[PDB]
Amino acid sequence: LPNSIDSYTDRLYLLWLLLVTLAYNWNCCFIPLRLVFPYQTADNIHYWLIADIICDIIYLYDMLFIQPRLQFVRGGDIIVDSNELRKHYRTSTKFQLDVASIIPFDICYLFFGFNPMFRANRMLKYTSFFEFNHHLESIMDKAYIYRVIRTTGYLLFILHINACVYYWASNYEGIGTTRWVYDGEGNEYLRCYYWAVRTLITIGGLPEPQTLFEIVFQLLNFFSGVFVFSSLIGQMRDVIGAATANQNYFRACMDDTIAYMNNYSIPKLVQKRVRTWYEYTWDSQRMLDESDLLKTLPTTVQLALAIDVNFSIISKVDLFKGCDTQMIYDMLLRLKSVLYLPGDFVCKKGEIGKEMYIIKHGEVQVLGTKVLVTLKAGSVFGEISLLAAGGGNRRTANVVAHGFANLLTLDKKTLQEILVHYPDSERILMKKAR
Amino acid sequence: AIVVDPSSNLYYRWLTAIALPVFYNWYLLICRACFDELQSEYLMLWLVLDYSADVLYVLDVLVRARTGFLEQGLMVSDTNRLWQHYKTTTQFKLDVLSLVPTDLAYLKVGTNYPEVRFNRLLKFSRLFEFFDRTETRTNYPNMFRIGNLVLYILIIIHWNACIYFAISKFIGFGTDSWVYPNISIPEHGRLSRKYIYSLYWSTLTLTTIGETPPPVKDEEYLFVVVDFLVGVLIFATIVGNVGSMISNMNASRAEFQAKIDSIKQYMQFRKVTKDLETRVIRWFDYLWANKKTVDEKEVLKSLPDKLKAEIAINVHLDTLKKVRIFQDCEAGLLVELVLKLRPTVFSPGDYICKKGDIGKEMYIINEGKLAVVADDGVTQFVVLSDGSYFGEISILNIKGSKSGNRRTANIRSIGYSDLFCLSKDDLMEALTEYPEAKKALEEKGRQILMKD
Amino acid sequence: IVVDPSSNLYYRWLTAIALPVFYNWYLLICRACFDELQSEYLMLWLVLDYSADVLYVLDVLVRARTGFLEQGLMVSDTNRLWQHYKTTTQFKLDVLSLVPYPEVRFNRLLKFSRLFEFFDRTETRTNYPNMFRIGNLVLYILIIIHWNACIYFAISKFIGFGTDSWVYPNISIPEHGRLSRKYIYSLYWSTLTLTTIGETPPPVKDEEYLFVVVDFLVGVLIFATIVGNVGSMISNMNASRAEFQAKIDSIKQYMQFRKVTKDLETRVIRWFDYLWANKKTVDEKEVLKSLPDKLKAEIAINVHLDTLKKVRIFQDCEAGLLVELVLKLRPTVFSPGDYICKKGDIGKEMYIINEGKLAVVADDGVTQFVVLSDGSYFGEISILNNRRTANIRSIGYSDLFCLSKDDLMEALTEYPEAKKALEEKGRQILMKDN
Amino acid sequence: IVVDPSSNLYYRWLTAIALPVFYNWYLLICRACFDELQSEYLMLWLVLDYSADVLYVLDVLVRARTGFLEQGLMVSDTNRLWQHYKTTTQFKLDVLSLVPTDTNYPEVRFNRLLKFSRLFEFFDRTETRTNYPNMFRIGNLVLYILIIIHWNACIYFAISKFIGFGTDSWVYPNISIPEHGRLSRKYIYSLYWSTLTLTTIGETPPPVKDEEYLFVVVDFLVGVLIFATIVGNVGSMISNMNASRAEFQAKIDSIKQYMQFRKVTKDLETRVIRWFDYLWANKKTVDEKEVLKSLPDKLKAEIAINVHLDTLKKVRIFQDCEAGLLVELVLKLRPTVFSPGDYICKKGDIGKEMYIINEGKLAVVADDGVTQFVVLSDGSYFGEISILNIKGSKSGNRRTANIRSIGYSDLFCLSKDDLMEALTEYPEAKKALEEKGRQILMKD
Numbered sequence A: 001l002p003n004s005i006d007s008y009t010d011r012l013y014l015l016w017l018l019l020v021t022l023a024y025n026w027n028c029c030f031i032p033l034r035l036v037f038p039y040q041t042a043d044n045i046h047y048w049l050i051a052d053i054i055c056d057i058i059y060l061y062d063m064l065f066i067q068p069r070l071q072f073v074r075g076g077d078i079i080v081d082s083n084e085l086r087k088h089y090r091t092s093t094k095f096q097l098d099v100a101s102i103i104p105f106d107i108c109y110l111f112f113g114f115n116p117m118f119r120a121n122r123m124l125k126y127t128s129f130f131e132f133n134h135h136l137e138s139i140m141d142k143a144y145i146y147r148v149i150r151t152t153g154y155l156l157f158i159l160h161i162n163a164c165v166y167y168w169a170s171n172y173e174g175i176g177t178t179r180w181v182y183d184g185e186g187n188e189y190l191r192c193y194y195w196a197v198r199t200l201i202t203i204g205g206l207p208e209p210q211t212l213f214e215i216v217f218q219l220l221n222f223f224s225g226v227f228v229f230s231s232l233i234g235q236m237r238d239v240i241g242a243a244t245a246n247q248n249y250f251r252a253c254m255d256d257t258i259a260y261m262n263n264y265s266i267p268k269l270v271q272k273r274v275r276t277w278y279e280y281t282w283d284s285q286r287m288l289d290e291s292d293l294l295k296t297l298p299t300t301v302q303l304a305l306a307i308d309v310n311f312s313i314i315s316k317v318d319l320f321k322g323c324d325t326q327m328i329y330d331m332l333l334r335l336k337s338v339l340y341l342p343g344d345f346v347c348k349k350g351e352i353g354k355e356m357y358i359i360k361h362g363e364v365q366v367l368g369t370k371v372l373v374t375l376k377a378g379s380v381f382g383e384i385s386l387l388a389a390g391g392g393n394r395r396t397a398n399v400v401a402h403g404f405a406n407l408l409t410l411d412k413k414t415l416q417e418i419l420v421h422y423p424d425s426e427r428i429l430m431k432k433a434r
Numbered sequence B: 001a002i003v004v005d006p007s008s009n010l011y012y013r014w015l016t017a018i019a020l021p022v023f024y025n026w027y028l029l030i031c032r033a034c035f036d037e038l039q040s041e042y043l044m045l046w047l048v049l050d051y052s053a054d055v056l057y058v059l060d061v062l063v064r065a066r067t068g069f070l071e072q073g074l075m076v077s078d079t080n081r082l083w084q085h086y087k088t089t090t091q092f093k094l095d096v097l098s099l100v101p102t103d104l105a106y107l108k109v110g111t112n113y114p115e116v117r118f119n120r121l122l123k124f125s126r127l128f129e130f131f132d133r134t135e136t137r138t139n140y141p142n143m144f145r146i147g148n149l150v151l152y153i154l155i156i157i158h159w160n161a162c163i164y165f166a167i168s169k170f171i172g173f174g175t176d177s178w179v180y181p182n183i184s185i186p187e188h189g190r191l192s193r194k195y196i197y198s199l200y201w202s203t204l205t206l207t208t209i210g211e212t213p214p215p216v217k218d219e220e221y222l223f224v225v226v227d228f229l230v231g232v233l234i235f236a237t238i239v240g241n242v243g244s245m246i247s248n249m250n251a252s253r254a255e256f257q258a259k260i261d262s263i264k265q266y267m268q269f270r271k272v273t274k275d276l277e278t279r280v281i282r283w284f285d286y287l288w289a290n291k292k293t294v295d296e297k298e299v300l301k302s303l304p305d306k307l308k309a310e311i312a313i314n315v316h317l318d319t320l321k322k323v324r325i326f327q328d329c330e331a332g333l334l335v336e337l338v339l340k341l342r343p344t345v346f347s348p349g350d351y352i353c354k355k356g357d358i359g360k361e362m363y364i365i366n367e368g369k370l371a372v373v374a375d376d377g378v379t380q381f382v383v384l385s386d387g388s389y390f391g392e393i394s395i396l397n398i399k400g401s402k403s404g405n406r407r408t409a410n411i412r413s414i415g416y417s418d419l420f421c422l423s424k425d426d427l428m429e430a431l432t433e434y435p436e437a438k439k440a441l442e443e444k445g446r447q448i449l450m451k452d
Numbered sequence C: 001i002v003v004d005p006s007s008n009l010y011y012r013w014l015t016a017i018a019l020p021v022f023y024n025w026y027l028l029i030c031r032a033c034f035d036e037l038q039s040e041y042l043m044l045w046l047v048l049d050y051s052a053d054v055l056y057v058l059d060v061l062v063r064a065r066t067g068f069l070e071q072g073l074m075v076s077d078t079n080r081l082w083q084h085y086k087t088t089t090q091f092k093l094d095v096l097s098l099v100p101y102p103e104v105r106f107n108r109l110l111k112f113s114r115l116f117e118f119f120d121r122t123e124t125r126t127n128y129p130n131m132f133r134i135g136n137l138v139l140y141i142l143i144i145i146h147w148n149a150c151i152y153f154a155i156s157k158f159i160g161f162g163t164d165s166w167v168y169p170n171i172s173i174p175e176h177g178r179l180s181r182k183y184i185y186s187l188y189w190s191t192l193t194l195t196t197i198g199e200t201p202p203p204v205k206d207e208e209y210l211f212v213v214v215d216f217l218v219g220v221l222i223f224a225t226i227v228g229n230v231g232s233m234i235s236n237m238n239a240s241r242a243e244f245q246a247k248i249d250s251i252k253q254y255m256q257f258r259k260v261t262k263d264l265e266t267r268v269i270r271w272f273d274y275l276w277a278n279k280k281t282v283d284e285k286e287v288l289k290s291l292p293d294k295l296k297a298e299i300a301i302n303v304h305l306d307t308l309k310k311v312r313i314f315q316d317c318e319a320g321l322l323v324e325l326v327l328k329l330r331p332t333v334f335s336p337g338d339y340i341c342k343k344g345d346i347g348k349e350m351y352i353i354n355e356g357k358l359a360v361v362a363d364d365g366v367t368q369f370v371v372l373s374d375g376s377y378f379g380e381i382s383i384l385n386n387r388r389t390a391n392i393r394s395i396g397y398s399d400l401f402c403l404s405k406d407d408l409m410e411a412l413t414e415y416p417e418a419k420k421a422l423e424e425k426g427r428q429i430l431m432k433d434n
Numbered sequence D: 001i002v003v004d005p006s007s008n009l010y011y012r013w014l015t016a017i018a019l020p021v022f023y024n025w026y027l028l029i030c031r032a033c034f035d036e037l038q039s040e041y042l043m044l045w046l047v048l049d050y051s052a053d054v055l056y057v058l059d060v061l062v063r064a065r066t067g068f069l070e071q072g073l074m075v076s077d078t079n080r081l082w083q084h085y086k087t088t089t090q091f092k093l094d095v096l097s098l099v100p101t102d103t104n105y106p107e108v109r110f111n112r113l114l115k116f117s118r119l120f121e122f123f124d125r126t127e128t129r130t131n132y133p134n135m136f137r138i139g140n141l142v143l144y145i146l147i148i149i150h151w152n153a154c155i156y157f158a159i160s161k162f163i164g165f166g167t168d169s170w171v172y173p174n175i176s177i178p179e180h181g182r183l184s185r186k187y188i189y190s191l192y193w194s195t196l197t198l199t200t201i202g203e204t205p206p207p208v209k210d211e212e213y214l215f216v217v218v219d220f221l222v223g224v225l226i227f228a229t230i231v232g233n234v235g236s237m238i239s240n241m242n243a244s245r246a247e248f249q250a251k252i253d254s255i256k257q258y259m260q261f262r263k264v265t266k267d268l269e270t271r272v273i274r275w276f277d278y279l280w281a282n283k284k285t286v287d288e289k290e291v292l293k294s295l296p297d298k299l300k301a302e303i304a305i306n307v308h309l310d311t312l313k314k315v316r317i318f319q320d321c322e323a324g325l326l327v328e329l330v331l332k333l334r335p336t337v338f339s340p341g342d343y344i345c346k347k348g349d350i351g352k353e354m355y356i357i358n359e360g361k362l363a364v365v366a367d368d369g370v371t372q373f374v375v376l377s378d379g380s381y382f383g384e385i386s387i388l389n390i391k392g393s394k395s396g397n398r399r400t401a402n403i404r405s406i407g408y409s410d411l412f413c414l415s416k417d418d419l420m421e422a423l424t425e426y427p428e429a430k431k432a433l434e435e436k437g438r439q440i441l442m443k444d
């Protein structure tokens, strides 16, 4: 047992949450079954008592030796010291919920005999189940699988509650009295669960209710089943939509682009190039644009994400050794990412150079039609646009992207307008140009 | 004498006290009109509740003739102008249609038609105004939306149940299988049995389940197909409204999880390092546990300017009274800075400014814990806390040392710090009138080159 | 003569031609599948079919002489209209539908595009868009229910009457022999099959089983279409109230996070209640972006000429001046007891009062020197000098037309005599008070 | 050799191998469940299954020679393709879907079903290659419905065979009666039972035994999960079919709600509803910068020069100077649609925009009266001197004429500072435009 248990990287705490969730599932899914069905007989009573003793020992351990060791933030810094952790846990709502759950009504077993209606307080500890749901959804990679399994488990649990309530209604009416109640010839829980499915899904086909308690029971059960089936529709549609929203948004944008290009009669070569661009963007980047995902973040995590991806390239280049770190940070923040299809011309000989290109996951070639030097990933080209004022110079070669080159663009005017701050960097880049 | 404010709480208590008998009028007046046994058995109770509803309706026309409205921004209190504005309104025509003294007709027919009190239902606009005010007042809007939709479809199910019992009374009882059975049987003769089986019929039809006996006559066939179409549209309304409630309950959690999954996809594509992965994910976990994931300007872009400035006061000045420099500064620059503040959040181990960069931002700590450090690792010179400031000397470009306007040190964040950003351009644009900041920051430059 | 396709006469013609098309669909499938509604009212369906064919050939002539738009203008060359209509497929559909047992008239259903264009034109022009969407949806599912009823009676006639238990019973028996009983039982069977309730008698033959399978799959997809359209109706019906409730909720949870004072939060709730009671949830700049610039200017010059006919000092400007004004005037609303500008404050804004009573005051003292009402404006002397003149307070829920510095600077170009006179009046008030 | 996974040869092959996978799933398992059907058509199923096996052999033989993308270019080393294909789990699925197990029980041939990723790849490639994408998505979900209906019909008939035939009321009836003994009625009644159970209508005969009770509970559960998961998906697809007209209807009823609230006059009401009806009748409601904001500059400008070509190639001076200049300008262009009887320019307003006329006619109208000086058709331009701001002329720095609209015109707006930063690199076209401006000044 460690001195202070955190939430983010404690797999032992996740296994403890799984054990507390298992004990809470035992109580909340076997208290109505043992309450209504005649399964708590004198023969299995050692099994049920030892299960409730094991679950209350798990509850007491979670009260005493795990939850007063949970780390938390107070005023910005994390809190490690144990007396303050204990006071922070003991002033919380989880502590009063757990102590309200652990009120030992097994001392009423001597009073009114064996009855699991007194054990209903162990269903009050739902916060441990919800934090287990949040932790597994935090660490899983495909969380929608677990969300679909949890929605299925919620539907099976509410059907089990409806089966227990139907068996209570049949025992209150008398087994086999009318035609609505459970007649008692097969498996009791299986036939009552069949009744619960064909009532709560609002299927029907069951026998018609005869007397007034059965009529108001079927009324309330169908009226709750309409909302339960509606919440099942809503939860399944919401979970699957939140699963596939990224691919659905990308497919909607591709469909709108193809609808525009066919609404204004664009030829098949350009439609093939746009289709190939969208397919390679989905196969490579898995998203539409990265700049829209960056510009909703804070600026310091934007700069951290930019430096961590591009400092390797911008330091691998030998021409970028004499610059300064503030130049590197601002220029790596303001880099614009672009993608060129194979066979395209990034700079044709005779055009004015206005962009400084950084190669990242691409293979380009400078060319008349004979190759001069192929550039690998992490290379650079387009340095002659550092001294061009207005028009300035032209592009001195035909540099052709050979494969699916993913260039990083850096403009001329932004380069000059931050470069005027640094005369030493401007001087060493001019000496590199000379 | 007094004129009631329509936005006061006494007006809302009146809306509750007048939305009670209108809802009673709807529900139990269609019940009393369709059954004629629940009308007959509890006649004294229905007489005293109808007298209560009539005196509350008279009190409602007396209140609506005495409430004021807003014209030219002012609240009128002239009772003659209020009576004229109420008299030239269709609500007055509805109230004088609703307050027809049908005691004369009730004693004239002989108390077999409670259909003569169906003009009392015409204050439905008052009930809808109560539901609108409770929607804009209450603290559980999803729970109130579900309760309002359940009350609407319960009124619809009760109305269709009473319509089915009136149709079976019109075709007669137990002649065929679809209608209500022969009511001379004492098992089918209980009033609660009548109402509960008729409500069971109405829910089985309007909930498109349909375990009822199949119709025989042509009017029963036509009523069952019209009722099934109304029921399938009501079921579509229930599924759509429950889906809207489920989306409204967790749309913020869903868009936050979508942003986390999208940035996780971006960081798994661009092969960032794993400590940066854990830092950004713990950062988003801290922003969710901090109840601060949306930016305050995107919250307050809908607000007017003085109200936005008052929220800026109520959030920022309780920290800005813990300062050590604005004791010799004035309230004009306090309110200008509180207009110019934008909060940024940081992570533990993250640098604010290193040694020797040209920064142009000033920062105010708010619920953080920062420290100036050297480049040798953790050598904390002094820990700064809430109510401090740094980065003020490098925006005026003053000298007196060999450095200029360069950040003199490394500033890291120990905990989950939360700063208030103040850049050069906005602060030097808005602060053009006060030299108190000029003399205080000149003293700051003099003493920072003293300790430098 | 040429008919304007966006006129009102063309919409009257869409109504006059969408009545017999909705006749043709409904009553041709009913007559053709029932064979007694045709045989009873023979002269009635004959004269209505003659009227429907006359309206069809008039629609052929109207679509022949209806004008279209090239180069943004109306084409009145009726020969060009003839060739433009003749090269389209709508002309081929019309001459297909005008080709001379009511099952031989099934080509009259080919003019469905006129009914769909009528429904789209009404969904554009009417003042109840969601009510018309509900009416169109119920009309679509009633057409589907009626067509399925006719199809069920046709399959029952093809298999024989009263042989099985699934088909319609024996028509020689007068209980099932009447036409009203036949039509209402086929309608009841198709409501039961398409809404997927399933209280129909079970099928016996293989063709009946296959038809009930195909019909239940069609009923599942139609019920999903009804659920989706009514959910979309609910969402776009309550979207505006839901987004303002989300704004209110974001405000309220942010202030619950930051522990707002009671008077300031009561002012916030009173402001949102004033908004909800005076129906200013609509945002002018957010909703008028889809209009062109002059159409943005003309509604604005209507409402702001209604507010500028009240003022007296700045009415010397007319068309151009106010056209540049109603373009760049924006509204802000102020609470009661609110300050517009104080003593020691720099001026940057002019205001025009509409629907509000403002009073000037002394230094923290309520003294009504002059009560500014509708008919004046204020706040222009402190921009063409120092600091704002004296405190300005709000009596009630006042609404102001704010005006930036750039606007009046741009307004100094045209009609300068008025502005120099009013700044002389500014100097007048300056020499008055100091 | 090597095949391109983005070509048309790989897609035609993908269709030719997605056919026997779907045959194997449906047909194969339908035959199995119906042992009697197998008995009746044995040589036909043996011929079709031998064809499916040789297609699976050629499937793994052509997946051993398909290329992938490393460093953005096509790899073509066949040994590298074989190593990269051996180092995945899809090849393990092709190995286990190829074993020769078999003519009496076709439950032994279920290894052929394992090539499901190939059919799913076919559905995805056809979805992104068709011209009716949402209609194909509805068709794909309908085909999934029919697969699940057929599979549960086969499962219901097989569990009826395992429990016995005609013993109960829930099970399939006695086979030796010639009415229920037909194979067509076997398949059609099992299809009816599974349609009812999976769409949760539930007018089947109720179960009597506990195995049947558990099967109907499980079946029901699956149906209510499955249909809600897939039939709801169809509902979502519908909304995607109607979404563009729905958002244009949201714009029109928000505008009409505002002008019903503000009590706007009926002439301007009819004018703005005529303008919105014109926009939806000419189908120019899709905002092209918002719909192509994701695309890069080269593809945006190639889309623009292939849409606006016939009314942009009518320019005199800036036609052959610099095609890249023209590319940058048409990328930076911005279209607006004007009403008839609308002023584009007035005497004395500050100029910030230049106008390229596209599919419309504008007339230079006088200061006081309506005298059409010259009508300007498509391809021409105006509004350049007030954004050039040059010395030597009268130099009023305002708009020097009145430009009115006779019809529903469309223009190309472009900003003054946008043209300045587009022509700071290129001064030759700027001095040509400048010369034109000077000439205009001289004239008037």
Ligand SMILES: Nc1nc2c(ncn2[C@@H]2O[C@@H]3COP(=O)(O)O[C@H]3[C@H]2O)c(=O)[nH]1
Pocket (backbone or CB within 6 Å): A347, A353, A366, A372, A373, A380, A381, A382, A383, A384, A385, A394, A395, A396, A397, A399
């Ligand atoms: N011509 C040329 N350019 C190169 C070479 N290697 C890198 N580059 C860059 O490629 C360029 C393409 O555009 P520029 O003419 O603008 O300028 C050229 C150089 O900056 C090389 O071997 N030849």
Ligand SMILES: Nc1nc2c(ncn2[C@@H]2O[C@@H]3COP(=O)(O)O[C@H]3[C@H]2O)c(=O)[nH]1
Pocket (backbone or CB within 6 Å): B353, B372, B381, B382, B389, B390, B391, B392, B393, B394, B406, B407, B408, B409, B411, B448
């Ligand atoms: N150098 C220094 N800066 C301090 C100290 N305490 C607070 N600060 C602020 O920390 C700063 C970090 O950035 P600056 O160089 O801009 O300016 C410095 C000061 O404003 C201290 O002891 N030394």
Ligand SMILES: Nc1nc2c(ncn2[C@@H]2O[C@@H]3COP(=O)(O)O[C@H]3[C@H]2O)c(=O)[nH]1
Pocket (backbone or CB within 6 Å): C341, C347, C369, C370, C377, C378, C379, C380, C381, C382, C383, C387, C388, C389, C390, C392, C429, C433
């Ligand atoms: N000083 C002053 N301003 C007035 C008076 N009546 C109306 N106003 C307006 O009130 C103003 C408040 O702001 P300004 O100084 O901008 O300019 C002043 C005038 O335009 C008056 O009697 N005195």
Ligand SMILES: Nc1nc2c(ncn2[C@@H]2O[C@@H]3COP(=O)(O)O[C@H]3[C@H]2O)c(=O)[nH]1
Pocket (backbone or CB within 6 Å): D345, D351, D364, D374, D381, D382, D383, D384, D385, D386, D387, D398, D399, D400, D401, D402, D403, D440, D444
């Ligand atoms: N002044 C002027 N402009 C003309 C004439 N014919 C066409 N135009 C265009 O009309 C214009 C109106 O706006 P601009 O001042 O922007 O520029 C002017 C010219 O481009 C003409 O005869 N005189």
Ligand SMILES: *[C@@H]1O[C@H](CO)[C@@H](O)[C@H](O)[C@H]1NC(C)=O
Pocket (backbone or CB within 6 Å): B173, B174, B175, B182, B183, B184, B185
């Ligand atoms: C109803 O019951 C009474 C007596 O119980 C009987 O006389 C009458 O005929 C019955 N009516 C019908 C329609 O069955």
Ligand SMILES: *[C@@H]1O[C@H](CO)[C@@H](O)[C@H](O)[C@H]1NC(C)=O
Pocket (backbone or CB within 6 Å): C160, C161, C162, C163, C170, C171, C172, C173
């Ligand atoms: C229907 O009834 C008539 C006489 O009523 C009879 O001749 C005919 O055979 C019946 N139809 C069938 C299908 O039995």
Ligand SMILES: *[C@@H]1O[C@H](CO)[C@@H](O)[C@H](O)[C@H]1NC(C)=O
Pocket (backbone or CB within 6 Å): D165, D166, D167, D174, D175, D176, D177
């Ligand atoms: C099926 O029919 C045959 C012949 O009638 C009979 O021998 C057999 O018992 C029947 N099976 C069942 C399960 O009834």
